Structure formats: structure tokens, C-alpha cells
């Protein structure tokens, strides 16, 4: 299973004129390109080395799409300000995200798309990819407007063909990294709290992709009667890391075991201390 | 043969802020609606009585299309200023026109669309209605841009279906006027110049539609040697008028006759002084 998805964000600035706009693209968990109008180079640039061997036709074409989009969003922004009777004095945000996913069969599986204003679901493309859905009694107009203009039509086109076709290309141009799995370096740490309790912290480092599972088990049994878990975080080198802890009564340390599941592992792993 | 066509105009106002924008719609030679942003009431309004019996859904919907359009043009305006390296200090014009025509069979015949900047052909929709055509080296970008976005696609949709469907409706709702033929009131006038020459002026008033033909001819043979003709002009009541004059030797007036052709006439008409 793989995916190609973008995340566009537009933020209004009352004083500074033109709204800030940013687009970033991803393949699975890897950002590969991006656009930012507040950058020295207001154009689409690579964020992954395996992109660098692309022609100027590409970068120019993409830079256009991006620019046009920034404009339409500028409009949409004022349009919305209208729908909600808001003043040009406040700041506002409009976000849009879309992606297409491939199944195991390496063929189209599902696609999606949706907008959101001031951090709230606004409009959404339906599963069938042929109809929209206002999700805010304000989005109502925007709904029909789009349904008359038949916008839904080619969005489906892009998602179904273009998106896929290119996703493949990207997978090839970046196989080395994209398709390369990197299993986690594991280990446990002991941290005494009181005279009767200590803390076992199961670590997992430098892994990829980000999907992973850590679980604390006593004498075969299950557990979390003190299992604190932290949100998977980025290492900063392209890989991730995550840890799960649990408070245990001293001298009973051997009883507990940490289980780790990751696609990069031939089979799960169990640690103990 | 009938037609439904609009004419949108956008003019930049250095200083006054937002560019002036105006849309007007016509069925054959009759203007029926219009939009103007400067106007006290900025929204789509009727220009023909036979429109007044239309629901608020209509007027609201149209007012939206108009508004959105004024926005995109505002953008297009700056965009173009770019393509040509022009300053915000000068004024500029962007015009767009489109129409669909019905044949005698009362079915789709032809459709069209084209833009123009500062009074010069800029971009154009091809006959097949599936491709654009830069008509300047600047429009080159705009060409592909549109061809990638597949704008041509639904423009064709509108033209082929929507445009037609509605044209019909308009014909019915206004049959009483749009279908009533109004033949011209004719007559000749004598205007002596010297004791030797005089001017014969063949008049044609209050007719509709505007298509018409006036021909001065001597002894039944065609003529041009002193045929001054004026461009068909509007009466101001919905009908038109036009006249053709010719200088003739005093005494030879009987040799001259004016011929008039108009769809509202069972057969052509011959006038002599």
C-alpha cells in the first residue's frame, strides 16, 4: 500500500497584503517536494535527492499549478469572508488536501479530497468521487456551485489517472529509499522511582515507515496499568522513533516484556531487561 | 436562426481600486439582462419585461456566476500585466464573449468563445471546441495552461448543452417579442442641392431584427456612383432604422428606385419618388 498526497495551506495577512501559501507533497511518509511563496525562490522545489534528476519542464509546470492555486485560494478566501460576514482585519485559514492510494495489487484503491476553513471541515468529495457535500450549513452554496460547474468531474480524473500514473513514476525514481524498509533498533531502560517502584521504558529507534506497535506484557498476559505511550516522532534524518513505558514493583522486572511489531521485522520482537 | 450571447468587459482603475466589470446578455438582437458592479444594486438584473417572471433562485445563481467572474478577471488582469511587463499605473481592458447558435432545425449549429486584451485578439476557442489557440506569443502560456486544466472541456459542455437548453426557454418566455417580426416603415425624401442636382434619401424605420438591405438602382440596374449609406442604428425602443442616399440630376428622378429587403416583408419592396 502506497500513496501520493499533498497538503495546501493558505493564510490571510491583513497588513502584509497577499496571503501566505504553502504546498507540500508526500509519498507514504516521505515529503518530496514543496512550494512556499514566502521563500526566496517562490517556486516548486525538491525536498528529496531522488527528485533532482527531473527536467525543467516539470518544475516549471508544477510552479504554475501552484501559483494558479495560490490565486484561486486568495479568491476563495475573500469569497468565504463573505459567506461568514467577517472583517478583513482578522486572519483566516483555508486548507485543502488530496491523495490517491494504491493497493497491494499495485492498482488504484481509493482517492479523496476535502477543504476546511478556520480548522473546521468545510467541503468534501464523496467516496464515489462524483459528488460534493457541504459540511457546514455555510458550505451549502459552495456545494451546488461546484455541482453545477461539474468540478467533481475532473477531480475524479486527476485522482483516478494522473495521480496514479505519477505515483508509480515516483516509486521508481525513488525505489532505493521509498521501497526500502528499515527495522527499529530496540532496547529497554530501567528507572527507579521509589523504593517499591521503577520504570521500564521500551525504546524503538531509527525506523521506517512510521507505522509501528509497542506493547507491554506480564507473564504472557496483557498490560497498561501504568503504560504511558508517546506519539510517534521524527528523528530528523527521515526515520522515526517511539517509546512505551510502564511502572513496575521492584524485583518483578523479569515478569514484564515489551513486544514490537514493524513491517521491517521478519517477525515480532520481545525484550525483557 | 437564433442565438444567445454575452459580452463581458473588465476595465482596470488605477487608484479607484477594484476594476469595473460589466456583463450583458442578448438573444438575437435583444439585450435581456445585465450585470454592473458600479451600479447602486450590484447584481444581475433584467432588461426585458418578459424576464421579470423569474424566480429568485435564477437571479441569485446568475449574480454568483457574475461575481465569481469579476474576481477571476481581476486576477487575469494582474496576471496579464505580468506577461506584458506593464505598470499598475495604466488602465487595461479584458473582454470575453461567447455564444451558441441554433439552426433552422431548431438544434445546435455552432458555438464560440474568445478573449481579447487592450482591444486585440488574445486567446480563442477552436471550431472543434476542444482546443485553444494563442493569438499572440503572450497567450502561449495561457494556451497550455488551459489545455492542461482542460478548461476547453466544459466550455464545450456549456456551449453544447446548457446554452442551448436555456436558449429555448428564453425563446418561449419571450416568443411574443423575440418571435414577432416587425417590417420597416419606408419612404423617400427629396433634397435639392443646386438647380441641377438633388439628393434622394431612402429611409427605413422602426424595424426588427436589424438585418436589412437597401439598394439604390437606376433603370433596374445596380448602383453605387453616389451611394452614401449609414450604419444601421438603434431607435431606442428596441427597433432599428437605416437610410441610403444618392445624388441625382434634377429631372432624372424617375430613373431611380430604392429596393428594400427584410425578413418581415412578404416580399421585397420598391420605392420611387
Amino acid at each position: 500500500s502506497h500513496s501520493l498526497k499533498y497538503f495546501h495551506t493558505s493564510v490571510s495577512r491583513p497588513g502584509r497584503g497577499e496571503p501566505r501559501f504553502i504546498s507540500v507533497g508526500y509519498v507514504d511518509d516521505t515529503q518530496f517536494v514543496r512550494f512556499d511563496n514566502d521563500a526566496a525562490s517562490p517556486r516548486m522545489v525538491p525536498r528529496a535527492p531522488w527528485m533532482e534528476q527531473e527536467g525543467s519542464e516539470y518544475w516549471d509546470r508544477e510552479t504554475r499549478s501552484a501559483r494558479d492555486t495560490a490565486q484561486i485560494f486568495r479568491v476563495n478566501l475573500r469569497t468565504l469572508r463573505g459567506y461568514y460576514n467577517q472583517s478583513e482585519a482578522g486572519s483566516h485559514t483555508l486548507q485543502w488536501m488530496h491523495g490517491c492510494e494504491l493497493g497491494p495489487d499495485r492498482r488504484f484503491l481509493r482517492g479523496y479530497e476535502q477543504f476546511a476553513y478556520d480548522g473546521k471541515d468545510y467541503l468534501t468529495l464523496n467516496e464515489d468521487l462524483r459528488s460534493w457535500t457541504a459540511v457546514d450549513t455555510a458550505a451549502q452554496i459552495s456545494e451546488q456551485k461546484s455541482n453545477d460547474a461539474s468540478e467533481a468531474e475532473h477531480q475524479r480524473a486527476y485522482l483516478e489517472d494522473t495521480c496514479v500514473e505519477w505515483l508509480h513514476k515516483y516509486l521508481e525514481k525513488g525505489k532505493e529509499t521509498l521501497l526500502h524498509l528499515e527495522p527499529p533498533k530496540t532496547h529497554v531502560t530501567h528507572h527507579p522511582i521509589s523504593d517499591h517502584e521503577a520504570t521500564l521504558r521500551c525504546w524503538a529507534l531509527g525506523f521506517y515507515p512510521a507505522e509501528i506497535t509497542l506493547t507491554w506484557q506480564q507473564d504472557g498476559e496483557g498490560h497498561t496499568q501504568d503504560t504511558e505511550l508517546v506519539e510517534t516522532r521524527p528523528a530528523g534524518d527521515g526515520t522515526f522513533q517511539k517509546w512505551a513505558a510502564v511502572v513496575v514493583p521492584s524485583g518483578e522486572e523479569q515478569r514484564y516484556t515489551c513486544h514490537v511489531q514493524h513491517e521491517g521485522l521478519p517477525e515480532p520482537v520481545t525484550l525483557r531487561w | 436562426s437564433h442565438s444567445l450571447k454575452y459580452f463581458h468587459t473588465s476595465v482596470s482603475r488605477p487608484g479607484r481600486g477594484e476594476p469595473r466589470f460589466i456583463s450583458v446578455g442578448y438573444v438575437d438582437d435583444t439585450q435581456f439582462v445585465r450585470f454592473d458592479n458600479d451600479a447602486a444594486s450590484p447584481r444581475m438584473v433584467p432588461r426585458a419585461p418578459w424576464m421579470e417572471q423569474e424566480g429568485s433562485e435564477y437571479w441569485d445563481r446568475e449574480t454568483r456566476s457574475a461575481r465569481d467572474t469579476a474576481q477571476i478577471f481581476r486576477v487575469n488582469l494582474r496576471t496579464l500585466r505580468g506577461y506584458y511587463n506593464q505598470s499598475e499605473a495604466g488602465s487595461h481592458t479584458l473582454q470575453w464573449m461567447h455564444g451558441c447558435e441554433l439552426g433552422p432545425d431548431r438544434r445546435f449549429l455552432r458555438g464560440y468563445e474568445q478573449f481579447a486584451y487592450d482591444g486585440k485578439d488574445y486567446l480563442t476557442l477552436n471550431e472543434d471546441l476542444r482546443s485553444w489557440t494563442a493569438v499572440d506569443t503572450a497567450a502561449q502560456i495561457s494556451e497550455q495552461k488551459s489545455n492542461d486544466a482542460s478548461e476547453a472541456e466544459h466550455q464545450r459542455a456549456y456551449l453544447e448543452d446548457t446554452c442551448v437548453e436555456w436558449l429555448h426557454k428564453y425563446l418561449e418566455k419571450g416568443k411574443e417579442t423575440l418571435l414577432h417580426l416587425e417590417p420597416p416603415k419606408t419612404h423617400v425624401t427629396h433634397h435639392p442641392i443646386s438647380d441641377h442636382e438633388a439628393t434622394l434619401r431612402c429611409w427605413a424605420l422602426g424595424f426588427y431584427p436589424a438585418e436589412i438591405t437597401l439598394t439604390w438602382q437606376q433603370d433596374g440596374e445596380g448602383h453605387t456612383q453616389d451611394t452614401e449609406l449609414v450604419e444601421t442604428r438603434p431607435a431606442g425602443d428596441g427597433t432599428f432604422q437605416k437610410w441610403a442616399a444618392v445624388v441625382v440630376p434634377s429631372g432624372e428622378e424617375q430613373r431611380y428606385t430604392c429596393h428594400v429587403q427584410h425578413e418581415g416583408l412578404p416580399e421585397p419592396v420598391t420605392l420611387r419618388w
Binding site: 484561486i72 461546484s146 486527476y158 494522473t162 | 465569481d68 492542461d148 482542460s150
Partner: peptide, 9 residues
């Protein structure tokens, strides 16, 4: 690549 056409709300 990013979609060639966005939506007019």
C-alpha cells in the same frame, strides 16, 4: 504532481 485545477468555492 499536484492537480492541474482547483476549486472555486
Amino acid at each position: 504532481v499536484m492537480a492541474p485545477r482547483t476549486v472555486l468555492l
